[PDB]
Design a protein around this ligand. Structure first.
Ligand SMILES: O=P(O)(O)OC[C@H]1O[C@@H](O)[C@H](O)[C@@H](O)[C@@H]1O
Ligand code: ALF
Ligand SMILES: [Mg+2]
Ligand code: NA
Length: 219
């Protein structure tokens, strides 16, 4: 049986992938880059703040100064942080709170494997901090998603091997990070975005402990 579940945050625990998208698109258009649409944004999900900005600049073959790069990432983050101040427990995605309760009942460790430095603030907004056995600090890994380091760190943090873990993700970068960590991925979203080669569910109501067991047994 699996011994840990490693959670992405944005687009898995709550609908904050939408707010990252809207904030990055606003940032891009301010600097004359109009190509950040929903299709392009599939390449930004799971990617660090600085890597996201660089992918947007690269889309436009645009070069900025080191000073302007730092200011742009800070500008987007300040906008995003204002957007999330009113997040509340009512914004937890369907199934997620019950899953956390069921995992703890069954002595399955719970770790956050988020790239977001805003992760702890968001778990507090949603009254979820108490469910987590560990939060892997994304500033501490030497390599961000799609590198597996954050999932390895989340597992290490709860004393479980990646190979004994399930990872939950809504992104391309994060699915690759889980694969390379040794854990079993279960994606949430569209197969057209996340692929046809792992288990994908259409929405988070499907993330029940019953279903994670159903998937783990059929691995
Ligand atoms: O800018 P933050 O809050 O540190 O978030 C980093 C990344 O966190 C990931 O969880 C999101 O999918 C990305 O969209 C985001 O860029
Ligand atoms: F959406 Al994340 F780490 F929370 F990639
Ligand atoms: Mg995500
Ligand atoms: Na709170």
């Amino acid at each position: 049986m699996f011994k840990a579940v490693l959670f992405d945050l944005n687009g898995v625990i709550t609908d904050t992938a939408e707010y990252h998208f809207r904030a990055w698109k606003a940032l891009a258009e301010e600097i004359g880059i109009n190509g950040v649409d929903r299709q392009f944004n599939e390449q930004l999900k799971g990617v660090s703040r600085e890597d996201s900005l660089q992918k947007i600049l690269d889309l436009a073959d645009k070069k900025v100064s080191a000073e302007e790069f730092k200011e742009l990432a800070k500008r987007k983050n300040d906008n995003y942080v204002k957007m999330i101040q009113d997040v509340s427990p009512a914004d937890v995605y369907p199934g997620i709170l019950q899953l956390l309760k069921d995992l703890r009942s069954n002595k399955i460790k719970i770790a956050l494997a988020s790239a977001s430095k805003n992760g702890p603030f968001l778990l507090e907004r949603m009254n979820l901090t108490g469910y987590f056995d560990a939060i892997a600090d994304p500033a501490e890994v030497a390599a961000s998603k799609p590198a597996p380091d954050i999932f390895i760190a989340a597992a290490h943090a709860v004393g479980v091997a990646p190979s004994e873990s399930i990872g939950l993700e809504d992104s391309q970068a994060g699915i690759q990070a889980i694969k390379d960590s040794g854990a079993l991925p279960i994606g949430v979203g569209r197969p057209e975005d996340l692929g046809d080669d792992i288990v994908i569910v259409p929405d988070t109501s499907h993330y029940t402990l019953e279903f994670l067991k159903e998937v783990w047994l059929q691995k």
